[PDB]
Amino acid sequence: SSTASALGKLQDVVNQNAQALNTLVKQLSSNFGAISSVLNDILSRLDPP
């Protein structure tokens, strides 16, 4: 009851999963060498070819 720092392994597993999801969803905001990081603007702004 007193010492909160008792369940470390479960918290570590949860943190690892959450961080993996966070970086996976954050990777969506990169140009990867393109002109924009959002696909809708590319569709609505530029010629298909």
Partner: protein
């Protein structure tokens, strides 16, 4: 029209631009755009042209 080393500069904003009447005219020898397909020009709103 001024010289190339003294190129004339102008800023336009706060208006509605119809590029179709610019596109259909054949009086222009070269009509070449880079970041936008000309036929979609009328479908976008910018600032500080």
């Amino acid at each position: 029209f001024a010289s190339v080393y003294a190129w004339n500069r102008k800023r336009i904003s706060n208006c509605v631009a119809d590029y179709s009447v610019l596109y259909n005219s054949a009086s222009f020898s070269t009509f070449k755009c880079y970041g936008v397909s000309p036929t979609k020009l009328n479908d976008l709103c910018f600032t500080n042209v």
